[PDB]
């Protein structure tokens, strides 16, 4: 989101070509401005993502939960996907499910891996699913 | 070509200097300069016309856009150039917003401010000058002085607009709104005085006049068994004074009113733009037990995080949201997210500017519950308002 | 009357319906392509195409690449998109068509409403100030030429060097200045492209001048945005090598303003050029706050002051004071000063009285194309 | 350049904003009314008003009655509505403005967008085939005149009667036929209105003819829709009385087709006119199925056949056969037959050979205005 | 002015005669006459152009509008005049509907058919003749003969379109749709053959070809553990034969299929327009245990009352409803009423023509649950369809 704010005037040409080509477009670190909901409205991202602090402040801050709820509703009403980052434990995984989140990244699943570790992660996961 | 007229709004003296120096070289005519709202409205009042206003849409010392709005009501301004070439996604929306003011969008200046680029914009202006609407000196925009005397001659009255449930129209509360009983112009809304009052630090004066007219009315409602809370707009500047919350409480006691009988409303932009010292008054009003509403909401989420505990019992969605429903349907998604937000915080949501029944039904469909607007009730003077508050 | 439309439409039933709707309203020929390869072959042998039509919603990365083929061929004028473009990305899409150097005629949805195909034809022929499409095409087509304005010595006849200026041979408007294209090029990031056309031309001219025994130094304007580029300096040398011209034969100018907003890494290119031996001028000097602080921190070999100092001398004595101060400054740092926009003898002598050595203006020469300049140079 | 706009706007702040928006774009004067009574007084003394503006969403029954005042004054040309009209009742609203005899220029919402006030001004002056507004105004303004075509005897010179025909003195197009207004009048239910203007004129002409000792019977066309009206017959007599002309001086014509679709209660008027003694013609006879069955069941005193029988005689012998059959028919029922559209002598004698007595066509006389007819009548 | 060309569609010989007689007097050119679809499409095929089609929008013996649709695809027709001056409220919508076909709306003729009125419409036509799109003889509209041979040479294939849940896209069933493997024109949808087949009583022939291709496919799905029911369109004429239900059951038995594996779909207009004798087959299919869907729904309610018990397990909303959502938002109210209807009857609702995700979300918001359209899946030939049915 902030990157897009500071972006060069020609940026939309590239974004429109990507959109028209059919690649996905994610607005990352969603909510870091200043005009966040207005901006989503003016460009059709297929995915938005929440910073990991949202999930971390879930125990202390009922507000963090609120904005997760709000964003869950925002994405479902635009028909786009939401990824929540920072899922470190199972209790925050279940809390996220009550709130209506669907996609996530975080240490609980897998930290970033080099190709082969990632492939082996994928095989395993597929194998787990099929049982 | 002639005596072009250019007003530069620039806060930061070194940018101002760079810009002005470049304009002097290349512009045939006068370059005018404003550092703040005060210079800007003064320059505007004395000028007959201002052909091109060069504006920076985020300043520390001045609200650029609010000056533009005021300028558009003046009749005196052809065109706008922006000196921040910002935010690619929101650029069209920024243009249209300028264009709906009456104004012509010429282009953006870069933060270089290259001389070549400047002449382009001038040729561009000069090719449009005729096709542009005539500049006239509209007498309906009261001057600063003229605003300053009205405010000294008790001619500002409180009006009340009901906030009602969307299914039914059951009464829930009301906002108190400023109107000017102008001696010779009639009855004026805030478009015609608020910006001046903001810029000359006269808002605090208006608030104390209206706040006590309003408590009078709240008193009368209590006496009528009518538990309608009244909500007053607090401008961010007023949060300047360490004693606001204490003055408000002394006044509530004076009128035999509990804090809960009343609400205060601040815009999101206002809440954002306020020093922490100033934010401490909201915390105080919150502890006293007043309602608090965050007003003109809808832009994002980072205003939620300014304070340790969220002091707000209500959120109000910006009027433009109802208008955009048909015009730009993706705004319905924001209405949904805001509905979801308010519910999750256990606070209330008002949606304003509800004029047609087709809007009313769609708002109910999105989950909205409380509303203000012409569809239900116009702003009323006290007695019409009191009479209105007899019907359940 | 009679137009030549080319429709690119994969889905055969869609093709069928589209073409048939076009027969009814379109006076003239119509061509047909079931994909990119077949369209690029209708192009490979055909004359003008008044309107190209393709569907950007349904496909996609083929449609884009097509339009580029359409672009590269030089053979298509206008575009109708065969799906309705989303209101929110309207300007984005148009601008995208125009950076291809194609005109956006309009858009419409399948099956076409016949009245809408008329509206756009009327609009199209109705087009029979330069646009973005115009600039891009002009640039993709070698219409931009370099002009030459000499830096002469004020006293005597003099000839010291020349500033290379960008001009555009417009097929309908004729010779035009940067204000009529720099906006477009600045906004859409074509400045680099224009630069290299002109730098090449400029060096070719520099050779012909070396062939003739002339130490005329050629100065090129560098846009600040280029200054950020990874290999500008390395590319300027490669060309100076390819042309067997030495660094010092050549100079680059950057305004004071533009130098202010220049990218963090601008210095990497600037040390290059300085070491190399290329001359480096700070143009429109005296525009920011810290002008004098700037000369201190970077060894510019030339300073240029602009049209307005000269004009203001007579009526405004403070200009004279700063002209003199600058003379002193250039004098003490051992660099050259050029004073721009000298139009009159009065002006000329005054400058001398003050201490200035080099000038430009209409007194000596207005900017000139390669030959008039070469002739000008054969004569001093 | 320069226009004269009149704004009706109650809410004073709204008035303020509107007028101010109109100063910027409207070259010319602007007037102001806080309600109907004040607007109707700006009218009561002013010249032309190029555009009237009022708000139909906010009020309401005042706005409508105003527009009628605007209408009645004869002083306003065009209308802009100061609220946006709902897409679903667009044509309804326009049509409503036009039955007032005002032109619909356009609509727009408060506060006005300045570009939109320009669009409509450009459109407005750009108006410097007849419209509904034109017909209504023409009719509210006595532009419609009666014309006269004589029913003559074929053999001899003859003069038996005349068909009163509707013509319109257009201030710019001149004399026009029903096809250029009957559509509009038919669609919007103004036929009655036109009828009574013409019936009055017609009787006035009938008097001047009685003053001159002339038994010229005047025949008027009655639209089937009128036939349903409660007091048509009673109103025709009241006027025949007021004019001291007898029933039999006059005749009413109704086509066979229109008689088919005529309202259930058409007979109540028809027995009236028959008793009264007025002549009743069945016009364009031979158009339905049961033509002969019709004459049986209603005692029409005249039958008329149209332009096409005459034209077809020469090339189509079946026409001749039906002309003869009709001659027999009229002959056996003791009524008159008029054959229309006789243009040539050949045609005339043939008709006689066949047995027809009365005719109309350009051979004898084309339709004529009151005086040319009166002169025509003084001469036989 | 010239050889105007006028085709009159009129069912009722006495109206036809009145109209034609009036037109002969006044029209310069030829008057053509059609009593039914057969004459009408024959006249159309032989003509090079038809300048004005005069049409009655409710006939017993002919569907006027369906002829217009076919005519609009022919290229040969300028303008339409309507001989029923009906329904004031729906008049604009009727015009636009004509105008979206390619056609020019000239006006309505009264049921008088006055000669004066006729010439108005002719002058009116004649003033527009040039501005109108060229008449060309489009070779893409297969002739009757040409349709008749395709149908005799096995070149009609069944396609399958999934009906899916709106949240997700989970598979629920599919409609079987007719496509023409045209030898030289490619693959054609029903626009290019159905109307002809309807008018020459060839639909029954198409249905038996497609119905058995479809049972083949339904058999393969069963075998795959894929309980996807397939739905086939039954044209009202086919209900003519007393043995339809019995033929359908013999065929289901032949393919080892229970009635419940299958559904049949009839339009509302079709169900309305059918004799009771014919309605008895639906009752039979209903008793056998087939699904039944009433197709292209949305016009009103009086179709609910034709039969003692409502035999329908499903309702489908007309495709145009999704398109009108933005275009005409009051149509969202009908979608709501239909949702409410289906629920109250305990039957299912499909909404067709769902192309964008913005539509999908709004439909879910209104209470819709099942859908068809390009957004989820295009009509597929069997193997693509079978492969598609592997993914859950
Ligand atoms: Mg407020
Ligand atoms: Mg330079
Ligand atoms: Mg007659
Ligand atoms: Mg179906």
From Swiss-Prot, chain A:
Record-level GO BP terms: negative regulation of DNA-templated transcription; phosphorelay signal transduction system
Residues holding Mg(2+): 28
Consequence the record notes for mutating residue 30 to A: 33.5-fold decrease in kcat
Stated consequence of mutating residue 51 to A: 8.4-fold decrease in kcat
Consequence when changing residue 1 to Q: 446-fold decrease in kcat
UniProt effect for mutating residue 85 to D: 30000-fold decrease in kcat
Coiled coil: none
Active-site residues (renumbered): 85 (proton acceptor)
Outcome, altering residue 88 to A: 1.3-fold decrease in kcat
Cited function: Phosphodiesterase (PDE) that catalyzes the hydrolysis of cyclic diguanylate (c-di-GMP) to 5'-pGpG. Cannot use cyclic AMP or cyclic GMP. Part of the RocSAR two-component regulatory signaling system (also known as the SadARS system), which regulates biofilm maturation, type III secretion and expression of the cup fimbrial-gene cluster. Negatively regulates the expression of cup genes by antagonizing the activity of RocA1.
Domain note: Contains an N-terminal phosphoreceiver (REC) domain and a C-terminal EAL domain that possesses c-di-GMP specific phosphodiesterase activity. The EAL domain contains a functional active site loop (loop 6), which plays crucial roles in stabilizing the overall protein structure and participating in catalysis, and also controls c-di-GMP and Mg(2+) ion binding. The response regulatory domain is involved in interaction with the Hpt domain of RocS1.
Protein name: Cyclic di-GMP phosphodiesterase RocR
Gene: rocR
